Amino acid sequence: LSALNPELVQAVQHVVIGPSSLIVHFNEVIGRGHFGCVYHGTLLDNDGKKIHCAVKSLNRITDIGEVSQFLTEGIIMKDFSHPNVLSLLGICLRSEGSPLVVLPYMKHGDLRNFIRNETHNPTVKDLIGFGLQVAKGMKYLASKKFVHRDLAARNCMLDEKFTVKVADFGLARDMYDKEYYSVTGAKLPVKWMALESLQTQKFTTKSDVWSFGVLLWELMTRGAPPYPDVNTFDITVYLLQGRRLLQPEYCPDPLYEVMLKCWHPKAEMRPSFSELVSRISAIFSTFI
Ligand SMILES: Fc1ccc(-c2cnc3nnc(C(F)(F)c4ccc5ncccc5c4)n3n2)cc1
């Protein structure tokens, strides 16, 4: 760590959490990604109050350049701030399990597992509401010209107030369910990817809009896997033939129309996230 560029160390200073401010419970894994396990922790603010944290210990870092890019990404990630986007609380360098990524604890876990849980009954309105929250988080990310590239219900989280946070980006980027990825060394979430992305491996905000349409379909089916009867390797031709996900039984017509628009073959014809927020707000307001 003494081998790092000192100016980079100074640049990341405001992101760093000292070990005397952090308690991590390393004996119980609360989440698993390909690139690291997550543990519960408590972070002490300057008032002495406790903030519950998810602390992720990154594996497979081998060289200073990777460490340097880790720090660089921590810096930009710290600058993101929106109620529907997962925040970076900080990183802990002087610890066992270093480097540690310190994120807010998400009481209700990932959105996909949440809606699949049979013991609760979110209403159609609640489910549309989760989609609206995701649209607002994406509207923010897109306004900063950030492209997520892996938007899906599995990659959004829910906190104790049922606020949805777009997650799985920056230092929190991972594969959290390897079943849905095919491996440039590119790991591709094929069934969420826009047609042009499948063909060229290029990604844009409009390809995020495509993924958002699939996410809406996930919400309306309460977490069904998309295209269950289509093999991963066959999705591209499926789409080129003029086929799309079918309308879920309890998906209102205007929302299925929104989904269809998100999957338009021409990227420029897809709605913006600002348009999605406005239209989905209207649809949401018609329930109950
Ligand atoms: F089964 C699954 C499926 C997905 C995820 C998932 C998805 N996106 C993420 N972005 N960051 C994280 C994370 F691992 F850092 C995290 C952040 C807060 C948590 N709060 C409480 C408990 C686990 C937490 C994990 N994820 N995780 C985790 C499990």
Ligand 1 neighbourhood includes 157 CB (under 6 angstroms): yes
Residues 146 and 254 in one domain: yes
Which of 74, 105, 136 is where one domain is finished? 105
Which of 39, 70, 105 is where one domain is finished? 105
Q: Which long-range contacts (CB under 8 A, 24 or more apart) does 267-274 make?
A: 267/194, 267/196, 267/204, 267/206, 267/207, 268/206, 270/206, 270/209, 270/210, 271/209, 272/142, 272/209, 273/135, 273/138, 273/139, 273/142, 273/205, 273/208, 273/209, 273/212, 274/139
Residues 101 and 131 in one domain: no
Plot region of 98 (φ>0 → left; ψ -120 to 50 → alpha; else → beta) = beta
CATH of the domain at 35: 3.30.200.20
Residues 24 and 128 in one domain: no
Distances (CA, A) of 16 to 44, 78, 85, 170, 225: 13, 10, 20, 16, 39
Ligand 1 neighbourhood includes 176 CB (under 6 angstroms): yes
Number of structural domains found in the chain: 2
Question: Looking at ligand 1, which residue's alpha carbon is closest to its atom 13?
Answer: 172
Give the other-Cβ count within 10 Å of 157's Cβ.
25
Give CA–CA dist 176/81, Å, rounded.
23
116 CB-contact burial (10 Å; exposed 0-12 / middle 13-18 / buried 19+): middle
Residue range(s) defining the domain that contains residue 33: 1-105
Distances (CA, A) of 18 to 92, 116, 132, 135: 6, 38, 37, 35
For 75, the token pair is 């810096």
Give CA–CA dist 279/285, Å, rounded.
10
For 198, the token pair is 């499948």
For 80, the token pair is 């993101």
Ligand 1 neighbourhood includes 167 CB (under 6 angstroms): yes
Cα 31 to averaged position of ligand 1 atoms, centre (Å): 6
Which value in Å is the resolution of this experimental model? 1.8
- Asked how this structure was determined, the answer is X-ray
Residues 76 and 171 in one domain: no
CATH of the domain at 268: 1.10.510.10
- Catalytic positions, written as ranges: 150
Quick one: which atom of ligand 1 is closest to the CA of 106? 20
**Mutual angle of helices 253-262 and 205-220, in 10-degree steps:** 150
| Short-list 72, 41, 42, CA closest to 57 | 41
Residues 101 and 115 in one domain: no
Instruction: Give the angle subtended at the CA of 271 by the CAs of 266 and 272, to the nearest 5°.
Output: 115
Residues 250 and 274 in one domain: yes
Ligand 1 neighbourhood includes 109 CB (under 6 angstroms): yes
